[PDB]
Amino acid sequence: PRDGKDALKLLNYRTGDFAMIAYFVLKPRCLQKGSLTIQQVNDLLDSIASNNSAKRKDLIKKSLLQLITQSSALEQKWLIRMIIKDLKLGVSQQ
DNA sequence: CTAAAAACATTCGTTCACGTGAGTTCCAGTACAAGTCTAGTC
């Protein structure tokens, strides 16, 4: 719902990072075991980037839908963090 | 020549000064993670 609690939590995240909110929202609404390998995720991200550079959003939506439906809550959280490019783990690049 | 007094020798308990080993805990240093780096218009 547009006015539902989940929508308000997702949109109003004080622009507790967005990844945690998405994980909490999707925890009772997604599967428990995914089936997407690293190669498939890389291919989907490559398609998303190539389509963004080509100014096409329908296929981006399709790829995101596939990722959402073929992933669990933790996988979705990590994918969101990767897309935002803010993967924090306590260990630096070095 | 003998007795009294002074001096010396050894032992014992106590206190003080230092040195040295061992066990426990605190702390100052060092390593690392993360954020920031100018401000605006179109």
3-state secondary structure chain A: CCCCHHHHHHHCCCCCCHHHHHHHHHHHHCECCCCCCHHHHHHHHHHHHHHHHCCCCHHHHHHHHHHHHCCEHHHHHHHHHHHHCCCCCCCCCC
Distance, Å, A88 CA → B33 C1': 10
Beta-carbon contacts of residue A19 (< 8 Å; ≥ 6 apart): A77, A78, A80, A81, A84
- Is there contact between A14 and strand B, defined as CB under 7 Å from any strand atom? no
Paired strand residues for A35? none
Please name the amino acid found at residue A54: A
Residue A93's identity, in one-letter code, is: Q
Distance A84 CA to B18 C1' (A): 69
Nearest to A61 by CA among A53, A52, A73: A52
